[PDB]
Amino acid sequence: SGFRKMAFPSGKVEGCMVQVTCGTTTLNGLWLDDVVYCPRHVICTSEDMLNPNYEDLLIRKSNHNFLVQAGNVQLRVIGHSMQNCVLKLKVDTANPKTPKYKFVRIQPGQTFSVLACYNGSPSGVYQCAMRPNFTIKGSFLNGSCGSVGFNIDYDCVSFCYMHHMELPTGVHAGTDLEGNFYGPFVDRQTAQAAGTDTTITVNVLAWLYAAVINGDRWFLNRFTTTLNDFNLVAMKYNYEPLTQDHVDILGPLSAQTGIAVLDMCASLKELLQNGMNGRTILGSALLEDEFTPFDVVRQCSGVT
Amino acid sequence: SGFRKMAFPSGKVEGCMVQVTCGTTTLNGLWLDDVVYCPRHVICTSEDMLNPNYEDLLIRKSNHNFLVQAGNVQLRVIGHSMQNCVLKLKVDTANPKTPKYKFVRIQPGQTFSVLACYNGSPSGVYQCAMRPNFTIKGSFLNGSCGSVGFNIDYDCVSFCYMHHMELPTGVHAGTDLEGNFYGPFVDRQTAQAAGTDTTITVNVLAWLYAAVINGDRWFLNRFTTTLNDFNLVAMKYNYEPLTQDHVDILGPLSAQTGIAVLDMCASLKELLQNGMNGRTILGSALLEDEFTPFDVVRQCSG
Numbered sequence: 001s002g003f004r005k006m007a008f009p010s011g012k013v014e015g016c017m018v019q020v021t022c023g024t025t026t027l028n029g030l031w032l033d034d035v036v037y038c039p040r041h042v043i044c045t046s047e048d049m050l051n052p053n054y055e056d057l058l059i060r061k062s063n064h065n066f067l068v069q070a071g072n073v074q075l076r077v078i079g080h081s082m083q084n085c086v087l088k089l090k091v092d093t094a095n096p097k098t099p100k101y102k103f104v105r106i107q108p109g110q111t112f113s114v115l116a117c118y119n120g121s122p123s124g125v126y127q128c129a130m131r132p133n134f135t136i137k138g139s140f141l142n143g144s145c146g147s148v149g150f151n152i153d154y155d156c157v158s159f160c161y162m163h164h165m166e167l168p169t170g171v172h173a174g175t176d177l178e179g180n181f182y183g184p185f186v187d188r189q190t191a192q193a194a195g196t197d198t199t200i201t202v203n204v205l206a207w208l209y210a211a212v213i214n215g216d217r218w219f220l221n222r223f224t225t226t227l228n229d230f231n232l233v234a235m236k237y238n239y240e241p242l243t244q245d246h247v248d249i250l251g252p253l254s255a256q257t258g259i260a261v262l263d264m265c266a267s268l269k270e271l272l273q274n275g276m277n278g279r280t281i282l283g284s285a286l287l288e289d290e291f292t293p294f295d296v297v298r299q300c301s302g303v304t
Numbered sequence: 305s306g307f308r309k310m311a312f313p314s315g316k317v318e319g320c321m322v323q324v325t326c327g328t329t330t331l332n333g334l335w336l337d338d339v340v341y342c343p344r345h346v347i348c349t350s351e352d353m354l355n356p357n358y359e360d361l362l363i364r365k366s367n368h369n370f371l372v373q374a375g376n377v378q379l380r381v382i383g384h385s386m387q388n389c390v391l392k393l394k395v396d397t398a399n400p401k402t403p404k405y406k407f408v409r410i411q412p413g414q415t416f417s418v419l420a421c422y423n424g425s426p427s428g429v430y431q432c433a434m435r436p437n438f439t440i441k442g443s444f445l446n447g448s449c450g451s452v453g454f455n456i457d458y459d460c461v462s463f464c465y466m467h468h469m470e471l472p473t474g475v476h477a478g479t480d481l482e483g484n485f486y487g488p489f490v491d492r493q494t495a496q497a498a499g500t501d502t503t504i505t506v507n508v509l510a511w512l513y514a515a516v517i518n519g520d521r522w523f524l525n526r527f528t529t530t531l532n533d534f535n536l537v538a539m540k541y542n543y544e545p546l547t548q549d550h551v552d553i554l555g556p557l558s559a560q561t562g563i564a565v566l567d568m569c570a571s572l573k574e575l576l577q578n579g580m581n582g583r584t585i586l587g588s589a590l591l592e593d594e595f596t597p598f599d600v601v602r603q604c605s606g
């Protein structure tokens with residue numbers, strides 16, 4: 001038993017991390033086969049960032065102006081192109097550690113692992129959720145751009161996030177690996193704000209099932225409610241509306257525990273209206289919303 | 305900015321994980337050079353659990369009683385011995401992915417990453433702390449024994465933990481890689497109870513510094529205290545006493561924030577006496593004690 005904030009094993013991604021330097025700017029890239037993917041703002045300087053002319057900046061560059069190092073060992077760039085907000089550097093060496101992979105766009109409320117990297121060197125791995133306002137509450141410092149988020153589906157690494165920037169509120173924004181931002185953000189330094197964040201209801205329910213599976217049942221009573229009546233309470237506490245599709249994906253956790261989804265909804269309603277009364281749930285005194293139903297199943301069933 | 309429960313990258317350890325089968329019992333092993341390490345209770349069955357006579361069980365086995373697989377390649381066993389509660393299986397092929405490593409025995413309050421594994425295949429990684437009562441609050445299912453805990457010191461993997469068992473309280477116990485249990489526990493299915501758990505004070509203070517670095521600052525008060533007076537408060541709330549070495553270890557965070565450790569102690573005193581009054585710190589409504597001062601520096605300096 002037990003429940004931790006668990007990330008995917010990072011080995012397959014570690015072997016893809018490189019550093020990309022353009023003049024005085026260095027950030028991280030993702031080296032897959034004979035291409036390195038990185039944020040295009042690596043070609044910028046301070047004079048550029050309000051309205052970078054990325055096409056102008058790139059055409060002034062030769063393959064020789066890009067310095068790519070894999071473990072501080074240089075790779076030769078033989079081509080360069082731009083796809084949306086990502087630079088694609090073609091190198092003369094294919095990465096022999098490239099895993100089976102896919103580029104995927106994740107949905108708000110879904111989770112992924114982030115391999116935080118600096119100067120092409122992995123520093124740590126943690127779990128993040130894509131917030132309903134299309135930011136992530138990550139942990140990133142100067143030099144972290146180009147760090148990626150990923151899930152492992154079977155034996156395939158599904159890359160879903162490349163890091164670009166931190167908003168003044170301390171939250172983070174980035175792109176998919178095709179270079180399209182999540183949310184209403186741009187890679188120019190205009191004043192940018194994320195929408196109001198909401199709590200991911202289906203994940204809170206998943207985590208309450210995780211608590212039941214682990215024997216932490218004090219919040220459970222033989223109560224139940226309707227989906228409409230639950231959602232009336234949810235919106236009073238800035239929780240996302242729970243749809244029948246959310247109910248369905250909680251099926252496996254309901255099946256394991258024998259607690260109907262709307263019974264757990266009734267328990268959650270009671271927690272929101274009356275509080276937790278100084279009690280903890282799986283070691284937390286707040287309601288946690290960055291575990292998906294699949295996250296709980298994986299950790300409560302040990303998939304490899 | 306930001307602050308997360310962050311583990312070490314697990315790649316160097318992933319390449320060391322194998323599956324060990326004895327009879328119909330399968331768990332995980334650690335393959336370094338030409339030795340596979342795993343919990344010795346792999347050689348047990350239902351009968352032996354009360355008081356396994358491990359020496360009898362092991363001497364009666366042959367090399368052929370052990371099936372070791374790295375992925376789907378079989379590693380032929382050429383010897384089998386016991387070191388404390390760990391089985392050492394000598395195999396014919398040395399692990400080509402053996403990292404620079406050390407076996408280290410860590411102290412209570414220190415943190416490490418756990419690569420949770422099943423049938424020799426990694427499932428996930430998370431961060432744990434050695435509790436003062438020498439248990440860990442991990443996440444382990446049946447088949448997870450032999451999973452290891454580690455820290456990374458640049459290029460060197462320091463293995464500190466191998467998973468053996470779960471106490472009925474939901475917490476976990478295991479050994480170092482020399483086979484010696486942390487705490488008073490034994491690998492027998494006997495009524496075993498963990499001593500009273502306490503809160504790791506130096507880690508709470510490190511996390512409060514992480515909060516200040518991240519802009520959470522409402523809990524700061526202008527008072528300073530002394531180490532003796534603070535420790536009287538620690539004792540009341542089942543916090544570990546704070547030593548001068550702890551204070552000095554917090555020095556890098558005090559230097560980054562300009563807040564003296566004993567000033568942060570006075571802020572923690574008020575938090576412990578009166579709670580947080582509906583406010584949060586780094587997204588938590590509890591005082592978090594599984595980040596060491598180093599974990600905060602490493603994450604807040606990169």
Ligand SMILES: *[C@@H](CC(=O)OCC)[C@H](C[C@@H]1CCNC1=O)NC(=O)[C@H](Cc1ccccc1)NC(=O)[C@H](N)Cc1ccccc1
Pocket residue numbers: 025026027028041049140141142143144145146164165166167168172186187188189190191192305
């Ligand atoms: C990554 C940049 C990098 O690694 O290369 C230089 C060494 C860095 C990551 C943030 C720095 C601190 N922690 C972070 O996550 N990104 C930036 O510094 C970013 C550059 C940028 C990206 C897109 C558009 C304009 C500038 N600048 C920022 O994050 C600043 N907070 C400014 C900012 C930019 C856009 C929206 C809001 C604020």
Ligand SMILES: *[C@@H](CC(=O)OCC)[C@H](C[C@@H]1CCNC1=O)NC(=O)[C@H](Cc1ccccc1)NC(=O)[C@H](N)Cc1ccccc1
Pocket residue numbers: 001329330331332345353444445446447448449450468469470471472476490491492493494496
């Ligand atoms: C690991 C064993 C394994 O991999 O199986 C081989 C086929 C497993 C991990 C616990 C199971 C569920 N989650 C866990 O962390 N360990 C056991 O099952 C363990 C076996 C054992 C080890 C030493 C001494 C006796 C039995 N049994 C237990 O953990 C039970 N909770 C019984 C128990 C043992 C010791 C103290 C308190 C309870």
